[PDB]
Design a protein around this motif. Sequence first.
Motif, PDB file in Angstrom:
ATOM      1  N   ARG H  20       0.853  -1.184   0.000  1.00 38.78           N
ATOM      2  CA  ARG H  20       0.000   0.000   0.000  1.00 38.78           C
ATOM      3  C   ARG H  20       0.886   1.231   0.000  1.00 38.78           C
ATOM      4  NH1 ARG H  20      -1.603  -3.723   3.229  1.00 38.78           N
ATOM      5  NH2 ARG H  20      -0.524  -2.838   5.031  1.00 38.78           N
ATOM      6  N   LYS H  22       0.808   4.611  -2.384  1.00 37.83           N
ATOM      7  CA  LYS H  22       0.122   5.350  -3.428  1.00 37.83           C
ATOM      8  C   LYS H  22       0.959   6.577  -3.712  1.00 37.83           C
ATOM      9  CE  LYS H  22      -3.488   6.869  -5.878  1.00 37.83           C
ATOM     10  NZ  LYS H  22      -3.873   6.432  -7.257  1.00 37.83           N
ATOM     11  N   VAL H  23       1.697   6.531  -4.808  1.00 44.56           N
ATOM     12  CA  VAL H  23       2.421   7.680  -5.306  1.00 44.56           C
ATOM     13  C   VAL H  23       1.511   8.403  -6.276  1.00 44.56           C
ATOM     14  CG1 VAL H  23       4.473   8.512  -6.416  1.00 44.56           C
ATOM     15  CG2 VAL H  23       4.576   6.494  -5.044  1.00 44.56           C
ATOM     16  N   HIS H  24       1.320   9.696  -6.046  1.00 44.54           N
ATOM     17  CA  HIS H  24       0.411  10.490  -6.856  1.00 44.54           C
ATOM     18  C   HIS H  24       1.126  11.023  -8.095  1.00 44.54           C
ATOM     19  CE1 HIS H  24      -2.863  10.545  -3.883  1.00 44.54           C
ATOM     20  NE2 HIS H  24      -1.910  10.637  -2.978  1.00 44.54           N
ATOM     21  N   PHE H  25       1.404  10.110  -9.018  1.00 46.38           N
ATOM     22  CA  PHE H  25       1.740  10.519 -10.373  1.00 46.38           C
ATOM     23  C   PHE H  25       0.530  11.068 -11.097  1.00 46.38           C
ATOM     24  CE2 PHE H  25       4.156   6.678  -9.460  1.00 46.38           C
ATOM     25  CZ  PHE H  25       5.383   7.223  -9.365  1.00 46.38           C
ATOM     26  N   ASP H  26      -0.657  10.817 -10.559  1.00 46.21           N
ATOM     27  CA  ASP H  26      -1.926  11.151 -11.163  1.00 46.21           C
ATOM     28  C   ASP H  26      -2.205  12.639 -11.160  1.00 46.21           C
ATOM     29  OD1 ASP H  26      -2.490   8.424 -11.490  1.00 46.21           O
ATOM     30  OD2 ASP H  26      -3.266   8.302  -9.443  1.00 46.21           O
ATOM     31  N   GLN H  27      -1.374  13.428 -10.486  1.00 47.46           N
ATOM     32  CA  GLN H  27      -1.770  14.746 -10.018  1.00 47.46           C
ATOM     33  C   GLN H  27      -2.097  15.682 -11.168  1.00 47.46           C
ATOM     34  OE1 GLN H  27       1.337  16.484  -7.762  1.00 47.46           O
ATOM     35  NE2 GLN H  27      -0.005  17.895  -6.717  1.00 47.46           N
ATOM     36  N   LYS H  30      -4.994  14.424 -13.481  1.00 47.99           N
ATOM     37  CA  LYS H  30      -6.215  14.564 -12.716  1.00 47.99           C
ATOM     38  C   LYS H  30      -6.653  16.008 -12.605  1.00 47.99           C
ATOM     39  CE  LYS H  30      -6.845  11.342  -9.658  1.00 47.99           C
ATOM     40  NZ  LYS H  30      -7.157  10.615  -8.417  1.00 47.99           N
ATOM     41  N   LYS H  31      -5.714  16.933 -12.472  1.00 46.55           N
ATOM     42  CA  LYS H  31      -6.058  18.341 -12.544  1.00 46.55           C
ATOM     43  C   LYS H  31      -6.667  18.686 -13.885  1.00 46.55           C
ATOM     44  CE  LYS H  31      -3.916  22.770 -12.093  1.00 46.55           C
ATOM     45  NZ  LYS H  31      -2.746  23.470 -11.578  1.00 46.55           N
ATOM     46  N   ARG H  34     -10.163  17.355 -13.941  1.00 47.68           N
ATOM     47  CA  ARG H  34     -11.004  18.243 -13.156  1.00 47.68           C
ATOM     48  C   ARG H  34     -11.406  19.474 -13.947  1.00 47.68           C
ATOM     49  NH1 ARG H  34      -7.826  16.801  -7.976  1.00 47.68           N
ATOM     50  NH2 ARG H  34      -6.327  18.251  -8.848  1.00 47.68           N
TER      51      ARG H  34
END
Lengths: 101, 71, 119, 85, 14, 50, 52, 49
Positions: H20, H22-27, H30-31, H34
């Motif tokens: 567990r 979770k590295v936020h490469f999504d940032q 995802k912006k 949004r």
Amino acid sequence: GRVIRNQRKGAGSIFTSHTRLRQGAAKLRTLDYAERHGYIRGIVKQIVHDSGRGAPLAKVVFRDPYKYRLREEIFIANEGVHTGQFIYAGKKASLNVGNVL
Amino acid sequence: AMKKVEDGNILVFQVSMKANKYQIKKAVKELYEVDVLKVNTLVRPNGTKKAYVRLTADYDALDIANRIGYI
Amino acid sequence: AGVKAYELRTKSKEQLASQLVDLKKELAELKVQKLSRPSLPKIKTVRKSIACVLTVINEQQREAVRQLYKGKKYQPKDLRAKKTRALRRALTKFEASQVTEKQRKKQIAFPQRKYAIKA
Amino acid sequence: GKGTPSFGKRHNKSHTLCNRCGRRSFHVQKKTCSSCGYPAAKTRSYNWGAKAKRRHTTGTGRMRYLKHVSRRFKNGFQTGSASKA
Amino acid sequence: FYEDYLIFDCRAKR
Amino acid sequence: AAQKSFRIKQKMAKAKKQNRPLPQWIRLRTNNTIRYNAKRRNWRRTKMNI
Amino acid sequence: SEKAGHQTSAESWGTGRAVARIPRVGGGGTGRSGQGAFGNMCRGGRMFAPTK
Amino acid sequence: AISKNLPILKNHFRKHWQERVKVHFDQAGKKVSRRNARATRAAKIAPRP
RNA sequence: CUAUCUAGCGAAACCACAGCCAAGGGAACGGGCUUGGCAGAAUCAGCGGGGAAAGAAGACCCUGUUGAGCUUGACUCUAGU
RNA sequence: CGUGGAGGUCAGUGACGAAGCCUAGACCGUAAGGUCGGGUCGAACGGCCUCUAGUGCAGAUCUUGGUGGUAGUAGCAAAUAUUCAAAUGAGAACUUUGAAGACUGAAGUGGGGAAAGGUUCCACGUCAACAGCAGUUGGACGUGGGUUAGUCGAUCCUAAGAGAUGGGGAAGCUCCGUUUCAAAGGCCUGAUUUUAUGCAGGCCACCAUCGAAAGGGAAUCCGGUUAAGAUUCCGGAACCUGG
RNA sequence: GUCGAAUUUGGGUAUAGGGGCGAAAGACUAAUCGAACCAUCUAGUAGCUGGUUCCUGCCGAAGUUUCCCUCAGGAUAGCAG
RNA sequence: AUAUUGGCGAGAGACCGAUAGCGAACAAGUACAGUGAUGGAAAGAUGAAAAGAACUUUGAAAAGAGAGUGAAAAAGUACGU
RNA sequence: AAACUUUCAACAACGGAUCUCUUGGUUCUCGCAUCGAUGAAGAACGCAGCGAAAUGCGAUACGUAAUGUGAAUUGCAGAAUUCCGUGAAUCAUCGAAUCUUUGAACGCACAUUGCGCCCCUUGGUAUUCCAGGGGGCAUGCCUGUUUGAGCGUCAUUU
Ligand SMILES: [Zn+2]
């Protein structure tokens, strides 16, 4: 430790009984109406040996009182019981050997 | 098999593995217009079915096999 | 070459049956030759044409059954749709657009109005 | 005695073929496949057996019906046929 | 795989 | 065995038909890398286990 | 890949077989059987400090 | 284990934490998503704020 | 019958490098070092002194804050009753 | 000092030969290492400033692969035993035929089968690998052929036993149990002549199913035939079941 | 040694891992048995052994103190950079 | 709004570059092993193009020597280096 | 002195490193929601003019139809009317079909290519036997119909 021989005798794997040559369960006749209001007559057709039983068995034949049929019971033979012998089973039966008072 | 059809009046066919002797008899009667005396089936070791079909004496398998076009 | 389907779709059923048995006879007459010759590629076309004829017959009969069962519920399980187990089991737009009278009245009275904010 | 001679007595098959997996894993005396679990309804699987799941799961065969489901979805599960534009 | 039996000697070892 | 089941016989028949070398014209095809049949089986070398 | 090098059931054979004590691949009939496993120094192996 | 003068640390990594992470490469993506969703909602409610 | 020689065929164990001794010292018993004796290609058959020969991370012993099997008024529990 | 990659520069080198590899040929550096010449080779590669790391091997009874000495060595010695000629062939201790000498010696090295194997059966062609020598031969290689049943068997019956149903347990995968606290089914004659099968009667109560190619069991034998099939095919002569 | 039986044996069938089976050897349970095999937990822990990859330059030890179920180890002070 | 080593479809990387990277760049969950559960590989590159060596000769043949193709046979399907 | 041993070089070998390539992997991000009793995933067997596989398909079998593009496929052979066209193609697309034997698998079973029952029809001088052809026969539960059972129970009978 290990499970011992007496504990292994309840699963019934190789410790069951060998019951193929046995002629059947040596049960008395079912208690219907005759055996508690009178007597019923049967006849001993053969005395035979039962495997795993030191006492011989007597194949007594009675009649079904309700249907034309010849239900045969398997009795344990008693000392003096013989073939061609009439067995009397019931309440109003005589005190002779083989009878089921 | 060509020795069989000359001498014994026996046609040798490849047959569906779902078929039986009744169907084979009916079908030879239909497709070749011949009366069949007996059928003898084996499953070959390549998985196909082989039928030996023995006709009556009235007809000659040699004469209908070349009518089919193989001899 | 083979046979075409557009020219068979005009034919009746019995014509197609005759076409079909003729073609199967021809295929037999070819498979007796294929064992003598090494090569016989003509046979593919006959197989192909048999398949086309059968497809045409199947469609001709399935359409007859469609027109038979036309205009009634309970038509068969190979003529009506297939889509998916789930989508077949799901609510129709009727069954999903159903509302209560309590909510229909509130939707007619107080729906979301179209407002804009400058002045 | 326990090796080479005793291996000569081996001519009775404990396992034969299964009608759900075709693998020679069907025990004759228990009537149970040790790969597919047949005739249990549920195909035998365990998550400690990852390679095993990998060997039998979807995709390892033909997908006779499921190959086309993505395509039918893309086209919207439509019926009818085209119109000769 | 092989466990040969002749290396086993307890004579004179102990 | 001789007294055998149809299923076993069928699987044998398949193995028989499979017991072939390449057809040597496949080697001539374009972008061909098949040199030999690597799934080739012989009754002495390897058993089917059916 | 986190699975890399570890998709095997390898166990060291130990001592008494005249071989290194690295975990080895079991079974038969392959060539891979007996081969070293799980280790950085080993073919088919797991690299040291796998990149995260 | 205990050694020279350094503060007692309380690092909670005695579980299987590396399952567990979770590295936020999504940032950034995802912006973007949004922003595009905001624009889509706006277009659907085109006059509304 | 082998071994032995020939035609054909053709492995393995093992291998730091290697292979003559005495004494000396030295991890207290060296093929190598020091001092001496000595020392002439290539080799065949045998042999079983040595190579502290090979075979196995001693199985005896000890240590481990490593275990398992077994027992019991050990410690703590427990199915059952 | 060196290696893989990244930003930058050298408007860097290069099919007129990049990188790589060989080179008791040269030069520099204490060294790590760098550079040049020659040969081979064929398509990319480097110097400087910086970034970055899966970054430098002699060892781990290291891993994988490959190769040696050992060594043309050990050794190819159980089962009494081979020999002569001819033919074939490029070639014969081993193939084929013949002649001879021997063995198994009917509790056989014979003739058949069960399990298992699976096409090894048989023909033709054929010898690179296999047959621990050889090989013209082969259970090898390549190409093909080949297994015919009313009576032989399976199929059917039950055995030890296995196991649904009803029901009951269990969180549950599933367990118990196999006639059980079940409303557990189907068989003869018909009767009608809208007519097909209801009503008319009557009978019957077992209460799935699986389980034996050696148990039980309906019935086939001779002769002939193939390269290879036969109680199966041909010929003749029979038998059982069902209708 | 034994050889007409507590015999020998095929096939079917039952018994499955802390379980089976055992005319009892801790014997057998697919070359595995003082608790099989497969995969997973699992890259299990290891104060114990082995190994740990380029050059040069400058500096340069300790095997001692106190404590610890401590004595093949650690913390601590000391030596060193 | 959140999750998402699966599935479908896309785009990228200071990633690996055929002992690496997924076990698998190839007829790979294949071949092969195992009673079974399960285990589980190896294997990439001729050349731009097969133009893959006509023909002669020695040989029983394989093959050789020549010739020839090709920019190159110091590229001859045992093939880049 | 040769041989032998050892060292180095050239050429030849053994072997397959290095180098350069790369229709593969791995990770990150984005987007989507789609298996099945209308019979899934999976398995077995089979299908090509010449295929053992892989890939594809199911007795309509490396595929049918439909649509689109518009003249190929290719290793050999063959076909050609298919080339100013309702039309090539191992083409793409795919909405209509086929879809063996199985599998949740569904008549009962299955270590058997086993054993039945019902309807319609065909043939055999046949309601009954045999064979063929087509279509059917699982369980549980829900709604409803129909037929029923129970002094469980109400009313009304003379
Ligand atoms: Zn199975």
